[PDB]
Design an enzyme around this catalytic site. Structure first.
Site, short mmCIF file in Angstrom:
data_model
loop_
_atom_site.label_atom_id
_atom_site.label_comp_id
_atom_site.label_asym_id
_atom_site.label_seq_id
_atom_site.Cartn_x
_atom_site.Cartn_y
_atom_site.Cartn_z
CE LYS A 28 -4.25 -1.97 -0.01
NZ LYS A 28 -5.16 -1.98 -0.78
CD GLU A 36 -9.94 3.56 -0.14
OE1 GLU A 36 -9.18 2.97 -0.70
OE2 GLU A 36 -10.17 4.89 -0.22
CB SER A 47 0.18 -7.85 -0.31
OG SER A 47 -0.78 -8.48 0.53
C1 LIG Z 1 -1.55 -6.25 3.34
C2 LIG Z 1 -2.67 -6.16 2.29
N1 LIG Z 1 -2.62 -7.10 1.57
C3 LIG Z 1 -3.84 -7.14 0.61
C4 LIG Z 1 -4.72 -6.29 0.28
C5 LIG Z 1 -5.89 -6.43 -0.69
O1 LIG Z 1 -5.80 -5.32 -1.50
P1 LIG Z 1 -5.59 -5.11 -3.06
O2 LIG Z 1 -6.35 -6.14 -3.49
O3 LIG Z 1 -5.70 -3.54 -3.38
O4 LIG Z 1 -4.03 -5.33 -3.01
C6 LIG Z 1 -4.95 -5.19 1.41
C7 LIG Z 1 -6.17 -4.31 1.43
N2 LIG Z 1 -6.12 -3.23 2.48
C8 LIG Z 1 -6.99 -2.05 1.95
C9 LIG Z 1 -8.55 -2.66 2.25
O5 LIG Z 1 -8.86 -3.25 3.39
C10 LIG Z 1 -6.80 -1.19 3.62
O6 LIG Z 1 -7.90 -0.43 3.50
O7 LIG Z 1 -5.74 -1.21 4.11
C11 LIG Z 1 -3.93 -5.27 2.41
O8 LIG Z 1 -3.95 -4.32 3.70
#
Ligand SMILES: Cc1ncc(COP(=O)(O)O)c(CN[C@@H](CO)C(=O)O)c1O
Ligand SMILES: C=C(/N=C/c1c(COP(=O)(O)O)cnc(C)c1O)C(=O)O
Ligand code: NA
Ligand code: NA
Ligand code: NA
Lengths: 383, 385
Positions: free
Chosen positions: B82, B104, B371
C-alpha cells in the site's frame, strides 16, 4: 578477549570448553566463503539488506541545524537490527552441528529475531523472557509462538532481562552439546562481544558507503542508543579509525539520572564482573535492577567494548530521559512518517538536541534501530 | 478509461470536474523527469525499495514440487504494498497544490500508508474507516493517530469499507479544490484503476529483473491475492505481454463460496455498477451491493477492479478462491517454515501457491506476492486458534 581491561571470560569451568569451541568455530568460519555467501544471501533476500539511509528533510529544517540522516534498521525483517546477529549466529550454530537455539529477550525483538532465524533454518527455539517484559511487549510474545519458538517466562529474581540471562546460561550449561546460546547484544563472555559486534558491523559499512554517496563526505557525528550496545557497535565500528567522525552512545536516563530509575551503566555504573564479563554495571556491590520506558534498554550492564571506547575517549556517552524519548517518538512519527522503536527514540531525542547546536553544513547519522509497532501499548498508556 | 466493457466513470456530474483535473494532472506528471526522480527517491530511501525476491527453499522442498519465490512487500515501510501507491498519489496531490489527503481504509494498512505519506509530505490526513473495522483493527487506528492523521469512524449504512468509500466520496465532492481522495486499490472511477496499477507496477518490474537474476528466465506462474486488486495488478502488469507467464488472482473464499459469506467478486459475484465503475460485485436481489466477509480484513471490498474483470474475460489471468481455514493454515505454515509472518490477505496467495506447487514440476517457478506482514493480524489469528 579484552578491550583495554574490560571484557574477558569469567565463567565456570563447565563453560570454557563450549566457549573455546565457539571461538575456534567462529575463527574458522568467520571468513569461509560458503559461510559469507550464505550470510550475505539471507541478509539480502530474507532480511532485506541493505537498509536505506534516509535524509530527514522536514526534521532537519524544523531544527534548523545539522543535517539529520536516519540509518533505517526499522526496515530490517523482524523490525530491528537484532535480525542481523540472529542470522549470523544461527548459521554458525547450524555449521557447528547444533539442533537448538536458546536466547534471552527483553523488548522481544531478539527473541523474535532468534525465532525467525530458527524457523528459517529448521532449528528448535526456546526463548527466556522476564515476566514484566512478557506483559510489556505482548505482540512479540505471540510472534515468537507463531514463529514456532517456545517462550519461557522467568518470574524469579527481579523477573526481567537480567534474570532471563541467568536462566538461559543455566540452560546452556546443561544443553551445550546440541544447544547454541544466541546472545542478543555485545555482552557476556568472549567471544560473544566480538561475534555480535562483527555481525552488526554491516550497518556501519552500509551507512559509510551510503553517506559518501549522498553527501560526498563522512558524517560529523553518529548517534545510536546503547542498551547492551550492539546496534551502536554495529554502526560505530567501521568509523572507529575515522578520527574526524565523532561517536555518541545514548543510554536510558529513565526517570532521571539522580532518580535511581534508569539504565545508564556507562554514565552511573561501577566497574564489576557479571555475566562472564568485566564491564560497567549499575549497583547498590550487588547489581541494581534497572528501569527504562524502552524495554530494550532495560539492562543493568553494558558491553565491554563500549566501556573501552569510553575510557580511551573515542566515543562519548550521554543519556536521555523517558519524557525526552516519548517526545522524539511523536516528533518523528508526525514529522517524517516513521514510527520509531522507543529504544531508537532515545537516539533520535539526543540527535535533535545535538543537531540544534551544529551548523547547516554538518552531518549527523542516527541509527534507527527498530520500528515502534511493539511499543504502541506503552506509548498509549504513557499518554 | 475502459478495460473491455469494464471500468468507465459512472459518477454524478459533480465528480466529473474533479476527475478530469486529476486525469489531466496525472498525464502531465506520469513521465515528468522531476516527479519520477522524487517518487523513486522516496521509494528508495524512505520506503526501502527495492524489496527482495525470496526463495522459500524450505517450503519448496517440503512441498516437493515447484520453486516458490516470495516478493517481499511485507518489508516495505509500513508493512505492505500500500505504501507504493500512497507515496505516488500523495506526491502527485502535492504537485497539484493540494494540502489535504483523504482515504478509505478497511484493514488499516492503506490508512496507515496514507497517514505516513501525508506526514512525510506535510499534508493534513483524514482517514475514513467503518466503525466495525475501527474496533477490529484498533492498533492501525493508533498508528494513524500517532502519524498525525484523524480517523473518522463511519456510522452510515453497513459501517464497513463500502461505507467508508461512500463517506470519502461525499467529502471529496465538497473539498476537491484543496483535497485529494487517495484511493488504495485499483477501483473507483477513471483514472483511479489505471493510476493505482501504475504506482504498484514497480513490484513486477523488480520481480522480473530479480527472477531473471535468480533463475535466468521468467516464472511459470505469478500468484497474488485479490481484494480490489492493486497488489495483484502491480506484480501482474509487467508480465501481461509475456504470454507464457500464467497469472492467478486469489480471492477471499471466506466460510465458503456456497456459504454466502465470502468476498470473491470475480468468482461468485455479478456484473454491476458502483463506486464509479462497471465491474464484478456481490449483489442483493434488488441489485444493490451485498456485505462481504473474510477473516483477512483487507479482502473486505465487495467489488473488484475493472482491469481484473477485463483480464478475466480475455482469459489472461485465472481467478480462484481460498477459504478462511486455508489462509490460516498458510499463515502458520509460512511463519514456522520460513520465519515470515505474512498478512492474512497475503496468506490467501501463499495458501493457493502451496496447492499449485505440489501438482507442478521441480524445474517450474512460482512467484507469490507477499503483499504485507502479519503484525496487524495477531489478535485475529489468536482467536482463530
Ligand atoms: C496487506 C494487504 N494485502 C492485500 C490487500 C488487498 O488489497 P489489493 O487487492 O488492493 O492489493 C490489502 C487491503 N487493504 C485495504 C482494504 O482493506 C486497506 O484499507 O488497508 C492489505 O492491507
Ligand atoms: C533487549 C532487547 N532489545 C534491545 C534493543 C536495543 C538495545 O540493544 P543494543 O544496545 O544491543 O542495540 C536497541 N534497539 C532496539 C530496537 C532493541 O530492541 C531484546 O530484543 O531482547
Ligand atoms: Na545498560
Ligand atoms: Na531494501
Ligand atoms: Na472482493
Amino acid at each position: 578477549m579484552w578491550f583495554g581491561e574490560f571484557g574477558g571470560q569469567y565463567v565456570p569451568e563447565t563453560l570454557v570448553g563450549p566457549l573455546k569451541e565457539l571461538e575456534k568455530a567462529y575463527k574458522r568460519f568467520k571468513d569461509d566463503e560458503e559461510f559469507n555467501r550464505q550470510l550475505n544471501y539471507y541478509l539480502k533476500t530474507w532480511a532485506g539488506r541493505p537498509t536505506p539511509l534516509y535524509y530527514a528533510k522536514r526534521l532537519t529544517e524544523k531544527i534548523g541545524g545539522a543535517k539529520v540522516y536516519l540509518k533505517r534498521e526499522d526496515l530490517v525483517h523482524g523490525g530491528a537490527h537484532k535480525t542481523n546477529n540472529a542470522i549470523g549466529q544461527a548459521l554458525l550454530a547450524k555449521l557447528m552441528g547444533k539442533t537448538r537455539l536458546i536466547a534471552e529477550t527483553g523488548a522481544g525483538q531478539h527473541g523474535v529475531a532468534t525465532a525467525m532465524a530458527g524457523a528459517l533454518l529448521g532449528m528448535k527455539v526456546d526463548i527466556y523472557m522476564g515476566a514484566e517484559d512478557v506483559e510489556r511487549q505482548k505482540m512479540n510474545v505471540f510472534r515468537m509462538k507463531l514463529l514456532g519458538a517456545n517462550v519461557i517466562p522467568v518470574n524469579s529474581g527481579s523477573r526481567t532481562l537480567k534474570d532471563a540471562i541467568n536462566e538461559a546460561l543455566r540452560d546452556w550449561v546443561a544443553t551445550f552439546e546440541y544447544t547454541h546460546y544466541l546472545i542478543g547484544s555485545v555482552v557476556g563472555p568472549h567471544p560473544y562481544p566480538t561475534i555480535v559486534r562483527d555481525f552488526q558491523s554491516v550497518i556501519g559499512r552500509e551507512a559509510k558507503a551510503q553517506i559518501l554517496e549522498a553527501e560526498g563526505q563522512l558524517p560529523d557525528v553518529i548517534v545510536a542508543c546503547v542498551g547492551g550496545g550492539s546496534n551502536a557497535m554495529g554502526i560505530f565500528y567501521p568509523f572507529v579509525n575515522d578520527k574526524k567522525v565523532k561517536l555518541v552512545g545514548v543510554e536510558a536516563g529513565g526517570k532521571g539520572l539522580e532518580s535511581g530509575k534508569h539504565s545508564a551503566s556507562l554514565n552511573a555504573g561501577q566497574v564489576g564482573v557479571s555475566h562472564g564479563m568485566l564491564s560497567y554495571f549499575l549497583q547498590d556491590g550487588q547489581i541494581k535492577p534497572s528501569h527504562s520506558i524502552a524495554p530494550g534498554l532495560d539492562y543493568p550492564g553494558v558491553g565491554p567494548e563500549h566501556a573501552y571506547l569510553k575510557k580511551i575517549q573515542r566515543a562519548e556517552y550521554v543519556a536521555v530521559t523517558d519524557e525526552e524519548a516519548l517526545k522524539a517518538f511523536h516528533e518523528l512519527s508526525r514529522t517524517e512518517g516513521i514510527i520509531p522503536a522507543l529504544e531508537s527514540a532515545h537516539a533520535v531525542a539526543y540527535a535533535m538536541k545535538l543537531a540544534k547546536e551544529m551548523s547547516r553544513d554538518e552531518i549527523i547519522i542516527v541509527n534507527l534501530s527498530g520500528r515502534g509497532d511493539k511499543d504502541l501499548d506503552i506509548v498509549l498508556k504513557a499518554s
